[PDB]
Amino acid sequence: YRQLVNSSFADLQKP
Amino acid sequence: IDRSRAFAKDVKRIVVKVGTAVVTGKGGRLALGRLGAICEQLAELNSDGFEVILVSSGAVGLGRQRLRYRQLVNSSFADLQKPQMELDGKACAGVGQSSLMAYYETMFDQLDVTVAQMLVTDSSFRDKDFRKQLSETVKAMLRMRVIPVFNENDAISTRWDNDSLAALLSLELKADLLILLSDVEGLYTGPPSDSTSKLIHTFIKEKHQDEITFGERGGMTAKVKAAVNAAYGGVPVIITSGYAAENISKVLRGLRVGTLFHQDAHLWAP
Amino acid sequence: IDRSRAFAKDVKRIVVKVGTAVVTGKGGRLALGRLGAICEQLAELNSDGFEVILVSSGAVGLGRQRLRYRQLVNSSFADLQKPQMELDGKACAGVGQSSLMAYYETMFDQLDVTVAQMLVTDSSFRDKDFRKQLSETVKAMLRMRVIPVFNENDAISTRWDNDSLAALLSLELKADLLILLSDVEGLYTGPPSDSTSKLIHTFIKEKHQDEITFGERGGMTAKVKAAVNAAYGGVPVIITSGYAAENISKVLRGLRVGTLFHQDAHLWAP
Amino acid sequence: IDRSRAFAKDVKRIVVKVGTAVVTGKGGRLALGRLGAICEQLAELNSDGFEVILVSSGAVGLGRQRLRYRQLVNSSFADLQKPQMELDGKACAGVGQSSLMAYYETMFDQLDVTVAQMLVTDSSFRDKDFRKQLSETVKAMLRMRVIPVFNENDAISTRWDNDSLAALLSLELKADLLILLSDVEGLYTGPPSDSTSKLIHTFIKEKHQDEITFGERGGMTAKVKAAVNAAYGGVPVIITSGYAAENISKVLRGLRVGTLFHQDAHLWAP
Amino acid sequence: IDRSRAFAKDVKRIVVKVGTAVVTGKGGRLALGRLGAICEQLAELNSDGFEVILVSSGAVGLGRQRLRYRQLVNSSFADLQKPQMELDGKACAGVGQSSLMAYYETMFDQLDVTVAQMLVTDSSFRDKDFRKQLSETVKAMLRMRVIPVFNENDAISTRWDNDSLAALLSLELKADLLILLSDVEGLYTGPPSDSTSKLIHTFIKEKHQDEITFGERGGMTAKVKAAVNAAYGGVPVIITSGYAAENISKVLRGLRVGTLFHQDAHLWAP
Amino acid sequence: YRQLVNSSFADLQKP
Amino acid sequence: YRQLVNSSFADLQKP
Amino acid sequence: YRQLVNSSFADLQKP
Ligand SMILES: Nc1ncnc2c1ncn2[C@@H]1O[C@H](COP(=O)(O)OP(=O)(O)O)[C@@H](O)[C@H]1O
Ligand SMILES: Nc1ncnc2c1ncn2[C@@H]1O[C@H](COP(=O)(O)OP(=O)(O)O)[C@@H](O)[C@H]1O
Ligand SMILES: Nc1ncnc2c1ncn2[C@@H]1O[C@H](COP(=O)(O)OP(=O)(O)O)[C@@H](O)[C@H]1O
Ligand SMILES: Nc1ncnc2c1ncn2[C@@H]1O[C@H](COP(=O)(O)OP(=O)(O)O)[C@@H](O)[C@H]1O
Ligand SMILES: N[C@H](CCC(=O)OP(=O)(O)O)C(=O)O
Ligand SMILES: N[C@H](CCC(=O)OP(=O)(O)O)C(=O)O
Ligand SMILES: N[C@H](CCC(=O)OP(=O)(O)O)C(=O)O
Ligand SMILES: N[C@H](CCC(=O)OP(=O)(O)O)C(=O)O
Ligand SMILES: [Mg+2]
Ligand SMILES: [Mg+2]
Ligand SMILES: [Mg+2]
Ligand SMILES: [Mg+2]
């Protein structure tokens, strides 16, 4: 969850 | 047809300006239908032997929409809690100009019309050679059946709205008509909201200048200034709503619509 | 990896220039494949944390193609016997800039990249305020992950090629690398045609300047001048063929390809 | 709000059909403004939580325009004296479908909406498995916030208009509303030209079927047939002019506009 | 020029197939440069008096990319922790076909070429009338200097790859050459990875069929099957890498590149 | 024929 | 924060 | 002139 809360939306797009 | 619009029978070169309230719609996105109908009307005019010149606007807003999207795409959820910084205006215009030009080119290709982009700054107009060369280039482009689309280069400026730029080009190019497409049906003696303000049909500098009570880029005060400038200079000025594209054809058909600015209206005063 | 290209490990902001021999192909039409591969490489670089700046060219040629088509469409058969007059150059650039910008915007949208158009004239660079404000705007756009695409506004000029403009922007913006994409594999001691000319890998101002024998906008003499300017100024310069898009990644990977212009090459002299 | 349109408060899945008299304008070219306003309205509806399905048309006409242009471009002046042969219809549809799909995709990308193209022939509807699988696929696409755009594959047919296809899909997909965008304000008891024909607001199969006197793909007889089919089946049907895009929002707001086909109108008979 | 490719001097109607490994590049996005060079080559061939037919592919992948983007745009952060469901394939193809067709139309308009979209399912080929009518329509389109672009309608199928569809169309249309653009330089006696596999130049059904050891839509086994089918049928088959667009011109120039499938190779056996 | 020899290609496009 | 953690990216785009 | 009267518009486009 920490990683997600510190990701940029674009990052979520890339595996 | 009233003689107040008798000049509509011999108008050959016209200048059309579209404000940001016309090109951009909800949420800062492009008003597809409105802007598309305007382009259809312009292509129809160009086919019938008219040489038109379009001064558009809407670069800043589109730019802002796109840049905000990019910011949100790149942001990190932990950053959507704190408030975001307010975007750079010149970058916004730089993006919006490219987007608007691509969109215009797409639908003018769809209508089988060739268009050219001319971005001019205020500082460039201080040279006589620049004005002469611009007149030559625009004359050549108009002779080649191409619609010039001007604007102010905001991305590179070091700072006079498009309305004033429109008047300038119409006077420098000796155009026969200047049309200002706004979001309102025309000039009003007061705010359009109240019922105590009526629709003008002919502007009289001596009379009509005092009783107008404007509200608190440039709003309508600027528009009026630019129009009066163009008129005095020699080019009639017409203000009409850009929400209905058929307003252009009706204006060119002599139909009495919109607000007019003619120096000869002193004699044509009813 | 030779130490002559050791700077490729810390290059962050780069400037890429594409000549007209790269953007335009047969018949003055757009080189779709070449230009598309270049854009793919640029988008890949932008994703990996680089801030790139593209100075393109090809406006004049595309414009000419389109305007010639329009002339032929409007001509009357009785006019195809007599010879046609030669098109206006500034109108040509005005049309070509819009077409090129729309095309660039289309495929950068396809690659999910936001781009902005900045057209700057020579006369605008005589103000210190202009340079400061341009640096601020470009810094903001690069921080917002947007690729600026510059060029010279030919449509409005009153006349320094893009090569010189590239060098200027790279020195004013303190970029870490300047890449000149040409149609040849790189600088040569003579004409590329003969077999007596070999491929340089490092340019030495003291040595290599005399024996070069160039042929009879700006060709390669101008390119060399601009490169040496940028180098002396502080920004390394790389010249490589734009026909293979993977040349960009190879250059950024430290691979020894193309011609280099570094002031430190005096110490790095082999 | 009259209770005759009380169903407009719970309509969730709707089907919108645009006729060739709406998509195509003068000279067989695309009606940019009209079609753009329709797309803007559809995107606005899609944002507000509606799942819409568009069945369009205009492939044949656009195709014909483009193919005629190509024929004229390739013709030899000595061939413009003799009369040209009349173009193949299926080739015309094949070109027009691609052009229309590209144009739709362009402006739905502009409005930030994803669209999908589904071309279905009459012969494919004779399999139960096909209908089940189509329902599953369309349900998935609607759940994914994507607007399906159907049509008949004319390019490959071996031959039921879009109106009938619309009714079919609306009944197979259990849509809550079927809107038929035509060029007229709605159904009429006679030809719209004369002043002896008045505007219907609710269609009664028992009563209103006899006194209607239609003139001499499918015109309005077909439209009425398809509408009555959809109604009987269970899906209300609304016929309204496609010239004003705000008609869609007004219909979805419960405003009494257009012609309605409800089986419950027997009880709602005034 | 070896006599094994002597047929290249009289080939007039050709069929070109592009696999998904050619049209789609990194991340499921469109391979702009590769696909653009292919289109440039096809337009050049079309200008020189050839009638080409393109069977493309890449709908499913593009569709998937776009739909994934839409899912991520609509998702709620609380949903990015749990694993997302796997997308519907037919919806994916439905979106991808539209996107690919729009992209193809854009750059074929850029190259001044008219294209048409033909989507055909397997179930439609069970009627003799369908084949006759398809041959007539394709003949008319080819005579009108238009490039047909076929594919399988996946969005509506109830399920034979494009390779097999290519062979089918090439045999039904009596084309003079069938080119299969793959990601590899051609057929190999084994996997391309190891150094023990060499490049074939002519395929012999009697000899070469046994020693080939393929690995574990359709891969290369299917490709070979389809090629042998087309050959036996009468239409030579050429397999070559689609990464270099000049391979097409080299093949049409008689240069010995790629893998060939000719029934006459029994006599032309070296 | 005179009309044709004095038409502009665009004109041929319009009836 | 709860609202954000329960918003869809698109929602963040609209004020 | 004969050549012109027997050319296709496209041909005129190419030198
Ligand atoms: N006296 C007036 N008559 C008409 N409109 C006025 C008046 N005073 C203010 N306005 C307002 O000015 C607006 C148009 O100015 P502006 O917004 O600058 O045009 P645009 O931005 O579209 O170029 C109108 O929407 C109108 O409400
Ligand atoms: N000494 C040299 N070494 C390499 N190329 C040279 C030399 N002298 C002249 N050239 C020519 O200059 C050309 C590149 O200059 P230019 O045409 O101005 O680039 P572009 O127009 O693509 O920006 C090359 O095609 C090359 O043949
Ligand atoms: N009784 C009627 N009421 C209304 N319209 C009618 C009637 N009879 C014929 N029409 C004509 O039918 C036309 C609409 O049918 P059609 O052309 O098939 O729609 P589209 O082609 O736009 O799908 C209208 O333009 C209208 O003039
Ligand atoms: N004997 C073989 N010779 C060549 N390629 C082979 C062989 N066996 C398997 N392949 C593989 O098959 C692939 C091409 O098949 P395929 O992926 O179906 O093409 P596409 O998907 O591009 O249409 C090549 O990448 C190649 O590595
Ligand atoms: N740069 C231009 C400025 C135009 C302008 O300020 O005038 P207006 O938007 O009031 O017509 C733009 O915003 O698009
Ligand atoms: N106006 C620009 C000039 C660019 C220029 O002259 O430099 P080059 O075309 O040699 O790279 C154009 O032609 O596109
Ligand atoms: N192939 C479709 C047929 C559609 C059709 O015939 O119905 P209509 O054009 O009357 O709405 C087209 O013409 O675009
Ligand atoms: N629907 C088509 C299927 C094509 C296909 O499976 O063949 P291949 O992708 O192996 O060339 C697509 O995926 O684009
Ligand atoms: Mg203003
Ligand atoms: Mg040069
Ligand atoms: Mg009908
Ligand atoms: Mg396969």
Numbering used by the authors:
A (entry chain F), F (entry chain H), G (entry chain E), H (entry chain G): 72 to 86
B (entry chain C), C (entry chain D), D (entry chain B), E (entry chain A): 4 to 162, 174 to 230, 236 to 289
Q: How do the authors describe this structure?
A:
We first determined the cryo-EM structure of mixed-state AtP5CS2. Each helical unit is a tetramer, in which the GK domain is located at the core as one tetramer and the GPR domain is located on both sides as two dimers. Helical units are arranged in a perpendicular way, and an obvious interface consists of hooks located on the helical axis. The hook between adjacent helical units can be seen clearly in the side view of this model, and the whole filament appears as a cross in the top view due to the orthogonal assembly of AtP5CS2. After focus refinement, the central GK tetramer could reach an average 3.3 Å resolution, but no high-resolution reconstruction for the GPR domain was made. In the GK of AtP5CS2, we captured density corresponding to adenosine diphosphate (ADP) and G5P. Compared to ADP, RGP (PDB chemical ID for G5P) is closer to the tetramer centre, with the ammonia head of RGP stabilized by the amino acid D157, and the carbohydrate group recognized by the peptide nitrogen on the backbone from the initial part of the hook. The gamma phosphate group of RGP has a specific interaction with the surrounding amino acids, with the side chain of amino acids S60, T23 and K20, and the backbone of the amino acid R236 involved in stabilizing the gamma phosphate group of RGP. ADP is stabilized by the ATP-binding loop of AtP5CS2. Besides, between the RGP and ADP, there is a magnesium ion that was previously observed in the model of DmP5CS.
